[PDB]
RNA sequence: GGGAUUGCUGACUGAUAGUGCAAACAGUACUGUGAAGGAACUAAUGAAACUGGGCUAUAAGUGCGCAUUCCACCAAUACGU
RNA sequence: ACGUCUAUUGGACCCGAAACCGAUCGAUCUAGCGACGUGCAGGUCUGACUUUAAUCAGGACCGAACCCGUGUCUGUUGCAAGAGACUGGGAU
């Protein structure tokens, strides 16, 4: 009867009929061109005077290893 | 298996404005996917030697950022990225008619297309590699040119 | 965005580079590094040496006292500081900018019409009052108000007229002998705070404004005297609405619960600043 | 360096670079965090190469996209393309590396695991 | 081996952001990865002010 | 006056009337959603998507 | 009373029947603003209506797959293979 | 007791109302209200203010954009489950 319980049952019902977006989901997929849906991005800042300011600690940093060249493990193991 | 949840337009309207995180960690084990599209064969020969192009277009997932694509290319592939331009695309609709005629309709997963403009690596900048004619003569020739024909119809024979 | 442990590295780097004692160096490293100053080493050194090279060019300018008295001088370029005090000095041929750049960091940005005209209008606005000189040396770095870009000289004229209207000009002159930060308040907000103080600290009757206007007017004048004496004793009592207009009584009872009633406390609070701890407890 | 995703560069010549299999979880449990970090980066770059290479050809992946493209099950000579088989092995390797990392994160005792679940 | 990996908050070695990862818990970051987060926007302004 | 065109489309009004949140805002809307679930409808509300 | 496994259970039904659905995706397509309503479609065989032309004018065998009971190993108490 | 035929209670040989009682969904059509915003070509008359002057009023008049639908004709499984043409009414 609670609000969260109804939403959880809706999501469990939507767990079935999932995968590559068949049926009604083909039309419902076009809601992203109709109501400005925000995608799964991480926000890097905030507007103060309408000019966006990217906070430098929220800029993306990738900890790549020192050398991936002549490293002795490949993505494939011999049979 | 846990997968993509349904979202609701009223829910994103009500619980709106995602906030920036308080801390950002350097990303060990990143989950980010890029792929090129088709290149012209002369561009493919341009990549085969010296490994460079001024403009390369990529397919990504729509949860990425221009900063993330620029940082990933600079960090992993050693490139110099000047600017990124991102386009959000819908999936293609697919039709796969069944044993009884049903018109089974699919939709590909939504993708983001990035246009990445590159920069010459170090000292190699000569490979930008490009008489006159008056623009008054250009416009006057393009005004006396024959018009484009109207588009034929798919049943029409010409 | 700071690298973890950069605070110790910056404190050590300031000692290893330009001469500065560790306590004021820690003030630059910690207190004035929430913003207000760039955190980069090899950039504070360049500006500090460049501002150290401006002490001969200006007669009363000491770099160390100026950078500690107001630490936002180093977030601007040293050439801009040189031009800013030069142009402000031409708009104020009087006490030199060197003793004044260490108290006011406002003329780094809006010097030309701003600091000179506001200072001239404030000196004339207090000279047309009962003999107030208003030399600029007494100004504190919290006096960004009444000098910031956006207050008109007419607004200062209205502010001093309202200050000598809300307080009596003998009381306003005694109030302005200490802590000129009362000029920062707008006249409507200053009127609101003084009326709320007169309501809560009403010595005439109850917490309500007792003795409404022969002897009722005498009690009302005594209430105006008591609030102006508290303002002379402490300028921070004018900052009551930051807590609330109705929490002035709450802070007064937080002081009241210990021993006795109101009349003993009107004598006690006028003799010692017991309200500062109560306001800090409310914050 | 765009040659890395630009092509296999061994496929235009008629030779096969990878003739092997994908990593398994029991072998991946024996590798250290640094070795798993380097293998993860090498495997993601291999994933970008294989996705680009099967994007130049018009061949599906995942065996669920094949139903969408109306391509028959098994008897199509498309599941037998080398790039698709390598792509499935690379996805298995990345999934198994993720599974090993959460197993090691769940195998801890103090607040170090709250930091171990922040880099995975 | 689990013999190493113990809580080592001070294994920094003090390199601009190669100490950030082992402070958040790391052998060697690539120079290209640190080149991606540009460290020369303030350096050019410092050099121009010095000259 | 010709009839038949009572449906004037608007995304704001459609989501604000028959969306998830107005259904969840009231108890009887929540039993409407519950019997939509018990019937087995693939689309729970007019604004659901993924 | 209710929710899932099993039925050497059925003088129950056998695709206009039996659940609304035996099906690649049935509470689907589709209808309606909405609550809500809500189909058809198995594999062979190929009746009639209908429309053109013509005319008239030996209740058995043999193979496989299991189930029952014998046997010999059994957890040794229902059979375990 | 079985078999058959009647009878009673059940929906009780089948199909068919207008109904009544509850509690879901609907002001995206339409009626009223409320908040914010926008529009009213060209002229005509009357009253007022100021005039070295680039202002206002009238449920004013004629008349486009716009709103409505008086009369006639066409149409009547129509272009349209209420439309078209020409005349019309309002248009600060
Ligand atoms: Mg854009
Ligand atoms: Mg009309
Ligand atoms: Mg309709
Ligand atoms: Mg049936
Ligand atoms: Mg049938
Ligand atoms: Mg039936
Ligand atoms: Mg059949
Ligand atoms: Mg026949
Ligand atoms: Mg009988
Ligand atoms: Mg309603
Ligand atoms: Mg008209
Ligand atoms: Mg008329």
From TrEMBL, chain A:
Residues of the full protein shown: 25 to 103 of 112
UniProt lineage: Eukaryota, Viridiplantae, Chlorophyta, core chlorophytes, Chlorophyceae
Protein name listed in UniProt: Uncharacterized protein
Superkingdom of this protein's organism: Eukaryota
UniProtKB/TrEMBL annotation, chain C:
Official protein name in the record: Uncharacterized protein
Superkingdom as given in the UniProt entry: Eukaryota
TrEMBL record, chain E:
Similarity comment text for this entry: Belongs to the universal ribosomal protein uL24 family.
Record's protein name: KOW domain-containing protein
Domain of life, per lineage: Eukaryota
Residues spanning the membrane: none
Shown part of the complete sequence: 156 to 180 of 309
Protein species of origin: Chlamydomonas reinhardtii
From TrEMBL, chain F:
Domain of life: Eukaryota
UniProt record similarity statement: Belongs to the bacterial ribosomal protein bL34 family.
Name this polypeptide is given: Large ribosomal subunit protein bL34m
Organism field: Chlamydomonas reinhardtii
